[PDB]
A paper describes a structure:
Here we show that the virion of [name] has a prolate head, containing genome and ejection proteins, and a tail, which is formed of portal, adaptor, nozzle, and tail needle proteins and decorated with long and short fibers.
The closure of the caps is enabled by pentamers, which are bent in contrast to the flatter hexamers. The hexamers in the caps are more bent (H4, H5; 149-150°), whereas those that form the tubular part of the capsid are relatively flat (H1, H2L, H2R, H3; 154–164°). The major difference between the capsid proteins forming hexamers and pentamers is in the structure of the annular loop positioned at the tip of the axial domain. In hexamers, the annular loop protrudes away from the axial domain. The pore may serve for the passage of ions and water molecules from and into the capsid during genome packaging and ejection.
Numbering used by the authors:
A (entry chain C): 52 to 349
B (entry chain D): 52 to 151
C (entry chain D): 203 to 302
D (entry chain A): 102 to 151
The structure:
């Protein structure tokens, strides 16, 4: 969670008379894992045709489902899912094991894992998804808001345009919180801003070409005024109205069961197959990574 | 073929039954070919005297027309021309049922 | 063709990158741009704009090069350029060799 | 069993004979094709979604 604040003054009069310490121990965060199946159901008469390129119909469809589940995982891990499970405060509860579950054997809900936007110090819940219109709270260690809604101070608060230089404030907050992050993911629909950063309208930024047969229009590295480098990365599987600042060690993909192909029962007019991949996400510290939602000024 | 849209709400339950999923077929496309021809006819009344400059006018003009057809092939491949045929949209009715 | 006036037939100035964005979000991995010689000076014009955001500089160099044979989009996809004489002036193709 | 042999193979061969008889009857009775293809018998014409 955090360390102990400074409390400002630290004078003393030769005696403490404390209250058994102000330790305020660590807070325990938890996360859940979900299931991904992507069932497939083919007929038996459609498994013997010519199949010029597709060849084995069922094998081709299974490969397609594998690619589909991989894409769905890449999307969900960056989506705005919210931890949803039948357990609210009895997460561990090994002893009792939530006595108010067993007895029906069919009251099982839909396990939904915590997403990046949720684990990155959210500031509310817009119904079922993290809010993209309100900044998160302040970090108790130091004043830090790792979740900020942009303020496009370059447009007249009417055009829907991601702010040009609201990233330096987010980097400031990350530095105040002690992040050390060095990566910045962005959707392809926003690299235009990062490219325009090389230019401007006031005339203080402009490219040059001294007898060069090139028109390089790209940015893949940024350096904030504080001295922190940041490598930019493009990912077409992120929400266009969001920017994340990752860090390799800060996040990990937890796996209980590896992607396994199998087949359900039979005694039907169909040859069913399916896949099963159980996975979840983990985070070292919510206040480490940073998120930036896009919007227009009010 | 083209993969399906990526889902972002797969919240399947444990200890349940596998419900059938959505599948998509493979799209198909078609086209037509094109024929190119030339002519390098010659009279042969020449080649009996002492030819002056080149010799073998036949082969000369034939190589010329070869280069010409290569040029025209490039021009056709790079220029936009629709899938024009005499079938008139009957492309997918091979062996037209109307000999008319 | 927003930047230029309504006199030029047609061509873009900053919408050549929208096409690269579309190709990237589709899945294409092509880095080639074929163009006719007529609509070639426009490509070199990319190295200078009327707006105070792009200019050339020659530090007493007796070598004027108003040419461009390589482009790079913000996504990282390089793009070489080729000048085909047998192409039509009113078109520009972004493709790959193996795809065709 | 004594003559039945078993309950699986005997039943299977009996049903095989039955399906053979039914097949011969259905073939010799007379019935025209009714598969919904609408002139797309040739020209493979993949299932045409929708």
């Amino acid at each position: 969670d955090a360390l102990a604040s400074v409390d400002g003054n630290n004078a003393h009069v030769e005696g403490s008379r404390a209250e058994d310490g102000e330790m305020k121990p660590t807070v325990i965060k938890s996360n859940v894992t979900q299931i991904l199946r992507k069932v497939v159901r083919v007929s038996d008469t459609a498994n013997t045709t010519a199949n010029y390129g597709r060849g084995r119909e069922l094998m081709y469809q299974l490969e397609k489902k594998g690619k589909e589940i991989k894409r769905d995982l890449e999307k969900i891990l960056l989506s705005g899912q919210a931890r949803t499970d039948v357990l609210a405060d009895q997460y561990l509860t090994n002893s009792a094991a939530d006595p108010a579950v067993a007895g029906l054997n069919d009251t099982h809900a839909a396990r939904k894992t915590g997403a990046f936007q949720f684990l990155c110090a959210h500031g509310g819940l817009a119904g079922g998804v993290v809010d993209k219109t309100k900044n998160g709270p302040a970090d108790p260690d130091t004043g830090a808001v790792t979740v900020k809604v942009a303020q496009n101070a370059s447009n007249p608060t009417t055009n829907i345009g991601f702010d040009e230089a609201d990233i330096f404030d987010m980097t400031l907050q990350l530095y105040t919180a002690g992040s050390e992050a060095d990566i910045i993911m962005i959707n392809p629909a926003h690299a235009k801003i990062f490219a325009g950063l090389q230019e401007n309208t006031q005339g203080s930024r402009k490219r040059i070409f001294e007898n060069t047969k090139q028109f390089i229009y790209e940015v893949n590295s940024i350096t904030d005024p504080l001295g922190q480098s940041y490598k930019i990365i493009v990912n077409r599987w992120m929400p266009t109205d969001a920017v994340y600042f990752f860090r390799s060690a800060d996040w990990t993909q937890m796996v209980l069961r590896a992607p396994k192909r199998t087949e359900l029962a039979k005694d039907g007019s169909y040859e069913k197959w399916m896949i099963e991949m159980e996975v979840g996400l983990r985070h070292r510290n919510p206040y480490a990574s940073g998120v930036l939602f896009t919007a227009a000024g009010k």
